[PDB]
Design a binder for this molecule. Structure first.
Ligand SMILES: *[C@@H]1O[C@H](CO[C@@H]2O[C@@H](C)[C@@H](O)[C@@H](O)[C@@H]2O)[C@@H](O[C@@H]2O[C@H](CO)[C@@H](O)[C@H](O)[C@H]2NC(C)=O)[C@H](O)[C@H]1NC(C)=O
Ligand SMILES: O=c1ccn([C@@H]2O[C@H](COP(=O)(O)OP(=O)(O)O)[C@@H](O)[C@H]2O)c(=O)[nH]1
Ligand SMILES: *[C@@H]1O[C@H](CO)[C@@H](O)[C@H](O)[C@H]1NC(C)=O
Ligand code: NA
Length: 369
């Protein structure tokens, strides 16, 4: 009933039609799949793959010759994970899923179910209990990095994702952008703004499942170069993964970073400017990369949204905001798709499944050409 073609072109009438449908009593009562449904469905992997329409064969030789690794950190919403995995799944790639140690038993079993169906999807060999804004969020990605670097020698790039991400490019287009990177990494990395300093000048501790400022003053970072500011999300070469897992100075930086607030938002940005890190850029601010100029992740921050022809980096959210981040509505997609980033965040089947559906369809159609 929803014309996804009109949605992707940005037709206000079709968008309004989605907005109205979302408001109905009938929509909010719609039947949802449970983690138990997934435990059930994945007993028969052949039928699960067929039914859910995973892609079982690589689409081009170009893609076959360019394997990609993914690290996916999740804790809930099994249906969104299955949609995300299906959208990015290729037989030649690798997928490590980190399930939060605190997640529900049934969710963890459902993730293991899905993973058991694929030789190249698997659960991280070590799980962290992930506390919001803490080191354990970084630690989750490092765990996956460790597994992936050991399991195969031939993948080119690692991309980290969360459970509520969605691709806005096909595998083929991602591979081509990565080939265009020429062994360089790509992620946000900008001069540290002075209002983010309280996050690492002080020691933070977990008090009652919650990361809190102790007020204790930290030693300076063990680094010649500056700290840089960025995001949790990155696109990095295998050689970078290797270096970071084994280099001693990087290790000291990480150990120093453990008791900071949101270390994920400076750790990667910072390492990317250390000389000798594979794929790194010089620390000169001429090479700084903003979130819009990097390709890693398109994200809309509430306080930045506005009139793009008036200086706003992107137009207002059409979904809803959660902690200042736009969760995308169908009205966001048109503009989003003209951007160069590989993935976007956040989506949510509970808020606007029509956004995901149209994006999902468009990408599958586009790929099968
Ligand atoms: C596993 O699933 C099958 C199919 O159930 C359907 O799909 C599921 C994912 C979920 O959405 C269910 O609500 C759907 O009905 C189950 O087989 C069904 O069993 C019910 C109850 O006896 C029956 O009414 C249906 O006709 C059956 N459908 C089919 C296709 O056989 C099955 O019971 C589930 N098994 C377990 C162990 O939970
Ligand atoms: O209890 C939690 C909460 C968060 N996460 C993960 O941490 C990452 C970041 O979560 P989110 O994007 O919601 O944090 P925020 O958007 O508020 O910065 C995601 O991969 C989540 O799956 C987690 O593993 N356990
Ligand atoms: C959806 O809209 C497009 C573009 O306006 C139109 O060409 C197409 O026929 C429509 N699809 C259906 C099945 O109604
Ligand atoms: Na597996």
């Amino acid at each position: 009933n929803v014309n996804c073609t009109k949605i992707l072109q940005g037709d206000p009438e079709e968008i309004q039609k989605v907005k109205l449908e979302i408001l109905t009593v009938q929509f909010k009562k719609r039947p949802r799949w449970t983690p138990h449904d997934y435990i059930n469905m994945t007993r028969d992997c052949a039928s699960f793959i067929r039914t859910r329409k995973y892609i079982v064969e690589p689409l081009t030789k170009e893609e076959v010759g360019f394997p990609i690794a993914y690290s996916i950190v999740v804790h809930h919403k099994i249906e969104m994970l299955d949609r995300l995995l299906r959208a990015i799944y290729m037989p030649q790639n690798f997928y490590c899923i980190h399930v939060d140690r605190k997640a529900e038993e049934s969710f963890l079993a459902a993730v293991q179910g899905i993973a058991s169906c694929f030789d190249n999807v698997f659960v991280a060999s070590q799980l962290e209990s992930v506390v919001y804004a803490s080191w354990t969020r970084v630690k989750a990605d490092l765990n996956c990095m460790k597994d992936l670097y050991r399991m195969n020698a031939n993948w080119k790039y690692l991309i980290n994702l969360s459970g509520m991400d969605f691709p806005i490019k096909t595998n083929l287009e991602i591979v081509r952008k990565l080939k265009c990177s020429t062994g360089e990494n790509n992620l946000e990395t900008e001069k540290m703004p002075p209002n983010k300093e309280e996050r690492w000048k002080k020691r933070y501790a977990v008090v009652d499942g919650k990361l809190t400022n102790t007020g204790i003053v930290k030693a300076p970072p063990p680094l010649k170069t500056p700290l840089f500011s960025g995001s949790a999300y990155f696109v990095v070469t295998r050689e970078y993964v290797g270096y970071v897992l084994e280099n001693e100075n990087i290790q000291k930086l990480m150990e120093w970073a453990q008791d900071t607030y949101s270390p994920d938002e400076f750790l990667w940005a910072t390492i990317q400017r250390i000389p000798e890190v594979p794929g790194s850029f010089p620390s000169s601010n001429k090479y700084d990369l903003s979130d819009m100029n990097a390709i890693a992740r398109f994200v809309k921050w509430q306080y930045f949204e506005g009139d793009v022809s008036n200086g706003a980096p992107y137009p207002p959210c059409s979904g809803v905001h959660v902690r200042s981040v736009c969760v995308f509505g169908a009205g966001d997609l048109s503009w989003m798709l003209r951007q160069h980033h590989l993935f976007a965040n956040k989506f949510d089947m509970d808020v606007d499944p029509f956004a995901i559906q149209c994006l999902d369809e468009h990408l599958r159609r586009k790929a099968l050409e």
